[PDB]
Short mmCIF file of C-alpha atoms in Angstrom, two decimals:
data_model
loop_
_atom_site.label_atom_id
_atom_site.label_comp_id
_atom_site.label_asym_id
_atom_site.label_seq_id
_atom_site.Cartn_x
_atom_site.Cartn_y
_atom_site.Cartn_z
CA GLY A 226 0.00 0.00 0.00
CA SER A 227 1.45 3.30 1.20
CA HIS A 228 5.24 3.67 1.35
CA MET A 229 7.46 6.46 2.68
CA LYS A 230 11.20 6.38 3.26
CA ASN A 231 12.40 7.43 6.72
CA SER A 232 8.88 7.32 8.16
CA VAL A 233 7.15 5.97 11.26
CA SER A 234 3.88 4.07 10.95
CA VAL A 235 1.07 5.21 13.28
CA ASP A 236 -1.97 3.05 14.03
CA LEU A 237 -5.24 4.97 13.92
CA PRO A 238 -8.87 4.47 14.97
CA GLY A 239 -10.95 2.78 12.31
CA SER A 240 -8.26 0.24 11.36
CA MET A 241 -6.26 2.86 9.46
CA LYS A 242 -2.55 3.68 9.40
CA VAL A 243 -0.68 6.88 8.60
CA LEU A 244 3.01 7.19 7.72
CA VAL A 245 4.75 10.29 9.12
CA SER A 246 8.19 11.47 8.03
CA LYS A 247 10.96 11.17 10.61
CA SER A 248 12.21 14.57 9.43
CA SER A 249 10.44 17.86 8.84
CA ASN A 250 10.93 19.68 5.55
CA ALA A 251 12.16 23.24 4.95
CA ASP A 252 8.99 24.68 6.54
CA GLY A 253 9.37 22.37 9.54
CA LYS A 254 6.24 20.48 8.52
CA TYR A 255 6.04 16.69 8.45
CA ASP A 256 4.81 14.65 5.50
CA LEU A 257 1.77 12.40 6.10
CA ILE A 258 0.72 9.54 3.82
CA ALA A 259 -2.12 7.03 4.19
CA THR A 260 -3.92 4.54 1.97
CA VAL A 261 -7.67 4.32 2.59
CA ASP A 262 -9.81 2.07 0.38
CA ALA A 263 -6.87 1.80 -2.06
CA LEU A 264 -6.58 5.60 -2.46
CA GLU A 265 -3.42 7.35 -1.31
CA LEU A 266 -4.14 10.40 0.83
CA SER A 267 -1.45 12.93 1.68
CA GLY A 268 -0.96 16.04 3.78
CA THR A 269 1.54 18.02 5.80
CA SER A 270 1.26 18.79 9.50
CA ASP A 271 2.98 21.00 12.04
CA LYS A 272 3.04 17.91 14.29
CA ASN A 273 4.78 14.56 13.85
CA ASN A 274 2.55 12.25 15.91
CA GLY A 275 0.27 11.44 12.96
CA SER A 276 -2.43 14.06 13.47
CA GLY A 277 -3.43 16.40 10.69
CA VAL A 278 -5.40 16.43 7.46
CA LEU A 279 -4.75 14.21 4.46
CA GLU A 280 -6.46 14.54 1.09
CA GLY A 281 -6.80 12.68 -2.19
CA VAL A 282 -8.77 12.51 -5.42
CA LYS A 283 -10.60 9.40 -6.60
CA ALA A 284 -10.48 8.35 -10.26
CA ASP A 285 -14.02 9.78 -10.66
CA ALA A 286 -12.75 13.12 -9.22
CA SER A 287 -14.49 12.64 -5.84
CA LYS A 288 -12.55 14.43 -3.09
CA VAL A 289 -11.50 12.46 -0.01
CA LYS A 290 -10.38 14.01 3.26
CA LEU A 291 -9.07 12.22 6.36
CA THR A 292 -8.79 14.31 9.53
CA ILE A 293 -6.86 12.81 12.47
CA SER A 294 -7.45 14.45 15.86
CA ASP A 295 -4.48 15.96 17.69
CA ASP A 296 -4.41 13.17 20.31
CA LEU A 297 -5.04 10.47 17.66
CA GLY A 298 -8.25 9.50 19.44
CA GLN A 299 -10.59 10.11 16.51
CA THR A 300 -10.56 9.96 12.72
CA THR A 301 -12.99 11.65 10.34
CA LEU A 302 -13.14 10.27 6.79
CA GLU A 303 -15.18 12.44 4.43
CA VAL A 304 -15.97 11.82 0.77
CA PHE A 305 -17.22 14.78 -1.29
CA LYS A 306 -18.40 15.28 -4.84
CA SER A 307 -15.77 16.79 -7.14
CA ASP A 308 -16.65 20.25 -5.79
CA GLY A 309 -14.81 19.27 -2.59
CA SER A 310 -17.72 20.46 -0.44
CA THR A 311 -20.91 18.43 -1.08
CA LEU A 312 -20.66 15.48 1.31
CA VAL A 313 -21.27 11.99 -0.07
CA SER A 314 -20.23 10.03 3.03
CA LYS A 315 -18.77 10.75 6.43
CA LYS A 316 -17.44 8.34 9.06
CA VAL A 317 -16.15 9.41 12.48
CA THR A 318 -14.38 6.63 14.41
CA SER A 319 -13.07 6.84 17.97
CA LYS A 320 -10.31 4.85 19.64
CA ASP A 321 -12.90 2.97 21.71
CA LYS A 322 -14.33 1.61 18.39
CA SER A 323 -17.50 3.69 18.59
CA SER A 324 -18.40 5.43 15.36
CA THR A 325 -20.87 7.58 13.45
CA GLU A 326 -21.46 6.95 9.73
CA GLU A 327 -23.63 9.21 7.58
CA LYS A 328 -25.01 9.00 4.08
CA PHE A 329 -26.17 12.13 2.30
CA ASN A 330 -28.79 13.18 -0.23
CA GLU A 331 -27.83 14.77 -3.53
CA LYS A 332 -27.72 18.20 -1.85
CA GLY A 333 -25.20 17.01 0.72
CA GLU A 334 -27.60 16.77 3.67
CA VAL A 335 -27.57 13.79 6.03
CA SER A 336 -30.22 11.28 4.98
CA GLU A 337 -29.07 8.25 7.03
CA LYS A 338 -26.98 7.89 10.17
CA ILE A 339 -25.59 4.88 12.06
CA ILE A 340 -24.24 5.41 15.56
CA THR A 341 -22.20 2.42 16.73
CA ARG A 342 -21.49 2.39 20.45
CA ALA A 343 -18.26 1.13 21.96
CA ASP A 344 -20.13 -2.03 22.99
CA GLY A 345 -21.33 -2.75 19.45
CA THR A 346 -24.96 -1.75 19.96
CA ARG A 347 -26.25 0.69 17.34
CA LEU A 348 -28.74 3.46 16.64
CA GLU A 349 -29.82 3.36 12.98
CA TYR A 350 -31.57 6.34 11.45
CA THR A 351 -33.14 6.33 7.98
CA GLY A 352 -35.32 8.68 5.98
CA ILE A 353 -34.03 11.70 7.88
CA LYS A 354 -36.05 14.83 6.98
CA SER A 355 -35.05 18.48 7.02
CA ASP A 356 -36.90 19.08 10.29
CA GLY A 357 -34.64 16.45 11.87
CA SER A 358 -37.24 13.67 12.05
CA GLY A 359 -36.88 10.16 10.70
CA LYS A 360 -37.24 6.44 11.37
CA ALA A 361 -35.19 4.93 14.18
CA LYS A 362 -33.97 1.49 15.19
CA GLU A 363 -31.86 0.57 18.24
CA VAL A 364 -29.88 -2.64 17.69
CA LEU A 365 -29.23 -4.19 21.10
CA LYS A 366 -27.76 -7.55 22.12
CA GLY A 367 -30.49 -10.11 21.44
CA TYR A 368 -33.19 -7.82 20.04
CA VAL A 369 -34.04 -4.64 18.12
CA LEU A 370 -36.16 -1.71 19.35
CA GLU A 371 -38.08 0.29 16.76
CA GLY A 372 -39.34 3.85 16.73
CA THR A 373 -38.82 7.30 15.32
CA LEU A 374 -36.44 10.23 15.53
CA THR A 375 -37.06 13.92 16.19
CA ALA A 376 -34.57 16.77 16.47
CA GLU A 377 -34.36 16.51 20.25
CA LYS A 378 -34.78 12.81 20.93
CA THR A 379 -35.11 9.27 19.64
CA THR A 380 -38.25 7.49 20.82
CA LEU A 381 -38.23 3.68 20.74
CA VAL A 382 -41.61 2.11 21.43
CA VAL A 383 -42.69 -1.34 22.64
CA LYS A 384 -46.40 -2.15 22.79
CA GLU A 385 -48.16 -5.02 24.56
CA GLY A 386 -51.94 -5.00 24.75
CA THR A 387 -52.98 -1.51 25.86
CA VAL A 388 -49.56 -0.75 27.37
CA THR A 389 -46.99 1.42 25.58
CA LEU A 390 -43.38 1.63 26.76
CA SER A 391 -41.32 4.53 25.38
CA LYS A 392 -37.53 4.71 25.66
CA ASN A 393 -36.42 8.27 24.86
CA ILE A 394 -32.75 9.03 24.09
CA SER A 395 -31.71 12.69 23.91
CA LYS A 396 -29.11 13.87 21.40
CA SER A 397 -26.86 14.02 24.45
CA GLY A 398 -27.46 10.29 25.00
CA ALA A 399 -29.44 10.64 28.23
CA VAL A 400 -32.22 8.07 28.60
CA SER A 401 -35.71 8.66 29.92
CA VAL A 402 -38.56 6.17 29.94
CA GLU A 403 -42.31 6.40 30.20
CA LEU A 404 -45.21 4.00 30.25
CA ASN A 405 -48.83 4.51 29.26
CA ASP A 406 -51.81 2.20 29.70
CA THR A 407 -54.97 3.21 27.82
CA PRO A 408 -57.64 0.63 28.68
CA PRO A 409 -60.55 0.54 26.21
CA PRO A 410 -63.73 2.23 27.44
CA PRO A 411 -65.70 -0.14 29.66
CA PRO A 412 -68.65 -1.52 27.66
CA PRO A 413 -71.83 0.28 28.74
CA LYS A 414 -73.91 -2.00 30.92
CA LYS A 415 -77.38 -3.19 29.94
CA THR A 416 -80.17 -2.61 32.44
CA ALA A 417 -83.86 -3.37 32.04
CA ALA A 418 -87.26 -2.52 33.50
CA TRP A 419 -90.21 -4.91 33.50
CA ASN A 420 -93.77 -3.65 33.06
CA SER A 421 -96.01 -6.51 34.16
CA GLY A 422 -99.11 -4.71 32.90
CA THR A 423 -97.79 -4.72 29.33
CA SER A 424 -95.56 -7.83 29.63
CA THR A 425 -92.78 -5.64 28.23
CA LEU A 426 -89.09 -5.59 29.11
CA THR A 427 -87.48 -2.26 28.23
CA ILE A 428 -83.70 -2.38 27.89
CA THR A 429 -81.53 0.70 28.55
CA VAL A 430 -77.89 1.33 27.65
CA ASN A 431 -75.96 4.54 28.42
CA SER A 432 -79.11 6.13 29.89
CA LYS A 433 -81.06 5.60 26.63
CA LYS A 434 -83.86 3.10 26.04
CA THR A 435 -82.69 0.76 23.29
CA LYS A 436 -85.54 -1.71 22.73
CA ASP A 437 -88.77 -3.26 24.04
CA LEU A 438 -89.08 -7.04 24.29
CA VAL A 439 -92.76 -8.03 24.56
CA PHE A 440 -93.65 -11.47 25.91
CA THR A 441 -97.10 -11.96 24.43
CA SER A 442 -100.18 -13.93 25.41
CA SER A 443 -99.43 -16.01 22.29
CA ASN A 444 -96.19 -17.31 23.85
CA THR A 445 -94.13 -15.33 21.36
CA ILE A 446 -91.43 -12.68 21.79
CA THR A 447 -91.33 -9.47 19.76
CA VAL A 448 -88.56 -6.86 19.64
CA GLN A 449 -88.93 -3.20 18.71
CA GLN A 450 -86.19 -0.54 18.69
CA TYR A 451 -86.11 2.98 20.05
CA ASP A 452 -84.79 5.97 18.13
CA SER A 453 -81.19 7.12 18.63
CA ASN A 454 -82.34 9.47 21.41
CA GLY A 455 -84.18 6.76 23.34
CA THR A 456 -87.32 8.89 23.17
CA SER A 457 -89.94 6.65 21.55
CA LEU A 458 -90.26 3.42 19.59
CA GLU A 459 -89.57 3.37 15.87
CA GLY A 460 -90.76 1.10 13.10
CA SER A 461 -92.85 -1.94 13.99
CA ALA A 462 -92.32 -4.77 16.44
CA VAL A 463 -90.67 -7.83 14.88
CA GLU A 464 -91.56 -11.31 16.05
CA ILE A 465 -88.54 -13.40 17.00
CA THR A 466 -88.45 -16.72 15.17
CA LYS A 467 -85.15 -18.21 16.28
CA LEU A 468 -83.00 -18.31 19.38
CA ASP A 469 -80.14 -16.42 17.72
CA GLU A 470 -82.46 -13.42 17.36
CA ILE A 471 -82.95 -13.29 21.13
CA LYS A 472 -79.19 -13.44 21.66
CA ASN A 473 -78.71 -10.70 19.04
CA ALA A 474 -81.14 -8.43 20.86
CA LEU A 475 -79.03 -8.94 24.02
CA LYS A 476 -75.81 -7.86 22.27
CA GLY B 300 -114.08 -51.04 18.98
CA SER B 301 -116.69 -50.29 21.62
CA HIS B 302 -120.31 -51.24 20.92
CA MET B 303 -123.53 -50.60 22.86
CA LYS B 304 -127.09 -51.14 21.69
CA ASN B 305 -129.45 -48.16 22.07
CA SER B 306 -126.59 -45.77 22.80
CA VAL B 307 -125.48 -42.31 21.71
CA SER B 308 -121.84 -41.66 20.83
CA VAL B 309 -120.24 -38.61 22.49
CA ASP B 310 -117.03 -37.02 21.19
CA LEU B 311 -114.57 -36.17 23.94
CA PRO B 312 -111.39 -34.12 24.37
CA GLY B 313 -108.25 -36.07 23.57
CA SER B 314 -109.72 -37.76 20.48
CA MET B 315 -111.79 -40.15 22.61
CA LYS B 316 -115.41 -41.28 22.37
CA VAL B 317 -117.83 -42.57 24.98
CA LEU B 318 -121.06 -44.49 24.34
CA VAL B 319 -123.93 -43.64 26.70
CA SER B 320 -127.13 -45.67 26.97
CA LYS B 321 -130.29 -44.01 25.69
CA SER B 322 -132.10 -45.49 28.71
CA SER B 323 -131.28 -45.52 32.39
CA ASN B 324 -131.33 -48.80 34.29
CA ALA B 325 -133.33 -49.72 37.42
CA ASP B 326 -131.29 -47.26 39.52
CA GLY B 327 -131.79 -44.51 36.95
CA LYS B 328 -128.09 -44.60 36.09
CA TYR B 329 -126.80 -44.62 32.53
CA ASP B 330 -124.25 -47.09 31.18
CA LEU B 331 -120.99 -45.65 29.82
CA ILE B 332 -118.57 -47.54 27.57
CA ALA B 333 -115.34 -46.37 25.92
CA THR B 334 -112.34 -47.99 24.23
CA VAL B 335 -109.02 -46.30 25.00
CA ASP B 336 -105.79 -47.81 23.64
CA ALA B 337 -107.73 -51.00 22.79
CA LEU B 338 -109.00 -51.45 26.38
CA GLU B 339 -112.72 -51.26 27.07
CA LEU B 340 -113.54 -48.99 30.00
CA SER B 341 -116.97 -48.94 31.60
CA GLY B 342 -118.89 -47.06 34.26
CA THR B 343 -122.32 -45.85 35.28
CA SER B 344 -123.31 -42.22 35.77
CA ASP B 345 -126.23 -40.27 37.18
CA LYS B 346 -126.02 -38.15 34.01
CA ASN B 347 -126.52 -39.10 30.36
CA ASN B 348 -124.37 -36.49 28.58
CA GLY B 349 -121.23 -38.65 28.70
CA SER B 350 -119.66 -37.37 31.90
CA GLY B 351 -118.65 -39.73 34.67
CA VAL B 352 -115.96 -42.24 35.53
CA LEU B 353 -115.08 -45.32 33.49
CA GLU B 354 -112.68 -48.04 34.58
CA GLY B 355 -110.93 -51.09 33.19
CA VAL B 356 -108.17 -53.61 33.86
CA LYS B 357 -105.27 -54.23 31.49
CA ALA B 358 -104.06 -57.77 30.78
CA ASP B 359 -101.13 -57.12 33.17
CA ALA B 360 -103.66 -56.09 35.88
CA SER B 361 -102.86 -52.35 35.60
CA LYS B 362 -105.92 -50.28 36.53
CA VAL B 363 -107.16 -47.64 34.08
CA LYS B 364 -109.54 -44.83 34.97
CA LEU B 365 -111.07 -42.26 32.62
CA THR B 366 -112.81 -39.29 34.26
CA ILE B 367 -114.96 -37.05 32.02
CA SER B 368 -115.83 -33.62 33.45
CA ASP B 369 -119.50 -32.73 33.91
CA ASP B 370 -119.48 -30.26 31.00
CA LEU B 371 -117.38 -32.62 28.82
CA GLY B 372 -114.65 -29.98 28.62
CA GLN B 373 -111.88 -32.11 30.12
CA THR B 374 -110.82 -35.75 30.30
CA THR B 375 -108.42 -37.31 32.80
CA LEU B 376 -106.90 -40.67 31.84
CA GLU B 377 -105.01 -42.32 34.68
CA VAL B 378 -103.09 -45.60 34.64
CA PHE B 379 -102.24 -47.19 38.00
CA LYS B 380 -100.32 -50.24 39.12
CA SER B 381 -102.53 -53.20 40.04
CA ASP B 382 -103.10 -51.64 43.47
CA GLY B 383 -105.39 -49.11 41.75
CA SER B 384 -103.66 -46.20 43.49
CA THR B 385 -99.98 -45.90 42.49
CA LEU B 386 -100.01 -43.71 39.39
CA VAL B 387 -98.05 -44.86 36.35
CA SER B 388 -99.30 -42.21 33.90
CA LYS B 389 -101.78 -39.37 33.89
CA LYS B 390 -103.02 -37.26 30.98
CA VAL B 391 -105.47 -34.36 31.33
CA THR B 392 -106.81 -33.04 28.02
CA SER B 393 -109.06 -30.01 27.54
CA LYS B 394 -111.47 -29.22 24.72
CA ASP B 395 -109.12 -26.50 23.45
CA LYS B 396 -106.50 -29.27 22.85
CA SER B 397 -104.26 -28.15 25.69
CA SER B 398 -103.04 -30.97 27.89
CA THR B 399 -100.88 -32.06 30.80
CA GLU B 400 -99.12 -35.46 30.70
CA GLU B 401 -97.21 -36.87 33.65
CA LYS B 402 -94.91 -39.83 34.15
CA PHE B 403 -94.26 -41.17 37.62
CA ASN B 404 -91.47 -42.83 39.57
CA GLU B 405 -91.90 -46.26 41.13
CA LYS B 406 -93.45 -44.66 44.22
CA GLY B 407 -96.13 -42.94 42.16
CA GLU B 408 -94.68 -39.42 42.33
CA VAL B 409 -94.49 -37.19 39.26
CA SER B 410 -91.05 -37.43 37.69
CA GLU B 411 -91.79 -35.82 34.29
CA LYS B 412 -94.46 -33.43 33.09
CA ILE B 413 -95.38 -32.04 29.65
CA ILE B 414 -97.74 -29.08 29.48
CA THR B 415 -99.07 -28.56 25.94
CA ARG B 416 -100.74 -25.21 25.39
CA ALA B 417 -103.75 -24.71 23.16
CA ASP B 418 -101.40 -23.20 20.56
CA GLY B 419 -99.12 -26.24 20.51
CA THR B 420 -96.22 -24.70 22.43
CA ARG B 421 -95.03 -26.82 25.35
CA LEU B 422 -93.36 -26.75 28.76
CA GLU B 423 -91.32 -29.94 29.28
CA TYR B 424 -90.16 -30.88 32.76
CA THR B 425 -87.77 -33.74 33.49
CA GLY B 426 -85.89 -35.01 36.52
CA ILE B 427 -88.48 -33.56 38.89
CA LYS B 428 -87.29 -33.81 42.51
CA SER B 429 -89.28 -34.05 45.73
CA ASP B 430 -88.66 -30.37 46.53
CA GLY B 431 -90.40 -29.53 43.25
CA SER B 432 -87.27 -28.62 41.29
CA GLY B 433 -86.20 -30.03 37.94
CA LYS B 434 -84.98 -29.31 34.42
CA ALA B 435 -87.19 -27.22 32.17
CA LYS B 436 -87.59 -26.62 28.45
CA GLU B 437 -90.10 -24.33 26.71
CA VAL B 438 -90.83 -25.44 23.14
CA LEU B 439 -91.91 -22.38 21.17
CA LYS B 440 -92.57 -21.85 17.46
CA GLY B 441 -89.14 -21.71 15.83
CA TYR B 442 -86.94 -22.26 18.89
CA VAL B 443 -86.55 -23.83 22.34
CA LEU B 444 -85.80 -22.03 25.62
CA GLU B 445 -83.91 -23.94 28.30
CA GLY B 446 -83.78 -23.58 32.05
CA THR B 447 -84.87 -25.06 35.34
CA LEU B 448 -87.96 -25.54 37.47
CA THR B 449 -88.65 -24.71 41.11
CA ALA B 450 -91.83 -25.15 43.12
CA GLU B 451 -92.99 -21.60 42.48
CA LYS B 452 -91.72 -20.84 38.99
CA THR B 453 -90.04 -22.00 35.81
CA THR B 454 -86.97 -19.96 34.87
CA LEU B 455 -85.86 -20.07 31.23
CA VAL B 456 -82.50 -18.44 30.59
CA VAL B 457 -80.84 -16.98 27.49
CA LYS B 458 -77.24 -15.76 27.72
CA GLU B 459 -75.29 -13.57 25.31
CA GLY B 460 -71.88 -12.29 26.36
CA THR B 461 -72.25 -10.91 29.88
CA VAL B 462 -76.03 -10.46 29.53
CA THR B 463 -78.51 -12.90 31.06
CA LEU B 464 -82.21 -12.82 30.15
CA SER B 465 -84.56 -14.72 32.48
CA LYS B 466 -88.16 -15.56 31.58
CA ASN B 467 -89.99 -16.63 34.75
CA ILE B 468 -93.36 -18.43 34.54
CA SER B 469 -95.32 -18.89 37.77
CA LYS B 470 -97.35 -22.04 38.40
CA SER B 471 -100.30 -19.76 37.65
CA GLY B 472 -98.82 -19.09 34.19
CA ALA B 473 -98.01 -15.41 34.79
CA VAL B 474 -94.81 -14.27 33.06
CA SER B 475 -92.15 -11.99 34.48
CA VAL B 476 -88.83 -11.16 32.88
CA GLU B 477 -85.52 -9.82 34.12
CA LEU B 478 -82.19 -8.94 32.61
CA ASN B 479 -78.75 -8.84 34.19
CA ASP B 480 -75.47 -7.56 32.77
CA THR B 481 -72.34 -8.43 34.77
CA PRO B 482 -69.38 -6.85 32.97
CA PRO B 483 -66.01 -8.37 33.91
CA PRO B 484 -63.93 -6.26 36.29
CA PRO B 485 -62.05 -3.57 34.38
CA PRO B 486 -58.40 -4.63 34.05
CA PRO B 487 -56.31 -2.67 36.55
CA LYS B 488 -54.34 0.01 34.75
CA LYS B 489 -50.54 0.07 34.66
CA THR B 490 -48.85 3.28 35.76
CA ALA B 491 -45.14 3.97 36.09
CA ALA B 492 -42.67 6.36 37.72
CA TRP B 493 -39.27 7.19 36.25
CA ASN B 494 -36.26 7.82 38.48
CA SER B 495 -33.68 9.50 36.25
CA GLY B 496 -31.02 9.21 38.95
CA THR B 497 -31.23 5.41 38.90
CA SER B 498 -32.45 5.03 35.27
CA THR B 499 -35.25 2.89 36.72
CA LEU B 500 -38.89 2.66 35.68
CA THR B 501 -41.09 1.37 38.50
CA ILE B 502 -44.43 -0.05 37.37
CA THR B 503 -47.48 -0.03 39.65
CA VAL B 504 -50.76 -1.95 39.33
CA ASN B 505 -53.67 -1.76 41.80
CA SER B 506 -51.65 0.58 44.06
CA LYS B 507 -48.81 -1.99 44.38
CA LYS B 508 -45.36 -1.74 42.82
CA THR B 509 -44.99 -4.73 40.50
CA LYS B 510 -41.50 -4.44 38.98
CA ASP B 511 -38.46 -2.27 38.26
CA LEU B 512 -37.14 -1.95 34.71
CA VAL B 513 -33.56 -0.63 34.76
CA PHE B 514 -32.12 0.90 31.60
CA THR B 515 -28.41 0.48 32.21
CA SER B 516 -25.28 2.31 31.09
CA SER B 517 -24.50 -0.91 29.17
CA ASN B 518 -27.53 -0.37 26.89
CA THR B 519 -29.30 -3.34 28.44
CA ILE B 520 -32.66 -3.70 30.19
CA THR B 521 -33.12 -5.64 33.42
CA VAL B 522 -36.39 -6.55 35.16
CA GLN B 523 -36.85 -7.32 38.85
CA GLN B 524 -40.13 -8.12 40.64
CA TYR B 525 -41.61 -6.82 43.86
CA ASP B 526 -43.15 -9.03 46.52
CA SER B 527 -46.92 -9.58 46.58
CA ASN B 528 -47.32 -6.58 48.91
CA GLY B 529 -45.38 -4.21 46.65
CA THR B 530 -43.07 -3.46 49.57
CA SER B 531 -39.57 -4.26 48.30
CA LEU B 532 -37.80 -6.05 45.47
CA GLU B 533 -37.39 -9.82 45.57
CA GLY B 534 -34.88 -12.13 43.96
CA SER B 535 -32.33 -10.69 41.55
CA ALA B 536 -32.66 -8.51 38.48
CA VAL B 537 -32.85 -10.50 35.23
CA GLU B 538 -31.36 -9.14 32.04
CA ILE B 539 -33.78 -9.11 29.13
CA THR B 540 -32.38 -10.91 26.09
CA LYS B 541 -35.29 -10.82 23.65
CA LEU B 542 -38.08 -8.47 22.68
CA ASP B 543 -40.79 -10.89 23.85
CA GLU B 544 -39.44 -10.54 27.39
CA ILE B 545 -40.07 -6.79 27.32
CA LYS B 546 -43.62 -7.38 26.09
CA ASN B 547 -44.13 -10.01 28.81
CA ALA B 548 -43.07 -7.55 31.50
CA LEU B 549 -45.72 -5.14 30.14
CA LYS B 550 -48.51 -7.75 30.44
#
């Protein structure tokens, strides 16, 4: 790969290496050389520990820039369009093996982002919108949490029955958790009044009369409905002819 | 079948016929003859309209008695054991074609009873016990209602969901109806408190702490239960290793 006479090799975060000249040149700057994805990057630095900025040009004229932090604890690898300013990809890697990788839309704005923690768990963001929202996924050991992203926080949601658990992660990385239980409305209870004089059972639900069941001198049962206000009967009484029709009227 | 010289034939309820002599005998009583189920029954009456009591003896010595009401509106056909007093069957039939038929246990007590109304609907009682209870069935046009019998009333029951409809019929035949709705208890609602200092969500149900969910600095979730009183934690925290275990803890 990269070769430099009278150089020291420096190991970098992200499984990269930079060669730094043992000697400084006329300006007292040190030469830096690195090969990243088979492209040679080069720069000069005031320092000789391996920190600085290295640059190169892909065969398709894309511009590549590798920035190495002063203490060697972090690398930033950026790929631009040929203009040298519209980002195509960006990966920041720290010595503890955590990292942030971004993909960009055609205008150079972040459209996807993967945060890899030092322990290998990940936050994966896709479909990022200009207001900072998007779809979110937290990849943990043994399982994946799903949710959404806003500008201030990532909200991962687990649902079971009527219970919702929300794990919120601020851009700072602070965690806060909430739980909600929204039980369905209790079904309104049927009550009934019996008028022995008219052999009529009047059912009520939610304080409204719903129907009259008449138990006739002919040993039959009829059902008649009330209007939506429960004010008076509507239509005509219907004689029940099968058991399922009694059950239905009790629904 | 039955034959009598100088007699008039009288049609009776229950598709029976009695022959009555045109003349009274020395005592001024009239001869009555009838054939019921191929057995000739005979009696004498003070009256000549066909009312009275006729009796006969089956080939197995069972005693049969047919009583015809004074106005001919009702017949009672009883079959006894040879003692002439332990009932084996009894059928009362009215001119309007309603009827009551009873079967009896070996001690001559009613064990089953069918009431047939003039309109052909029926009440069917089986397994009648000495306290007057038993199983009940009302056979209506198009469907059958099921229930139970007590000494004072027959209670036919239709259930749908949590609703129970009861049709009560007194021994007099008066009808009264009731409805009950017993909704299940509303599921107790989960609530939770978040302690940011300990990154711990504490769930409560029915005013008792149920479990702690800890969201650790290692990007893991642990769950630990409280005792049945909700007083303090029990056992040891268990690390969640799959999504189903989070859902389970939310059940």
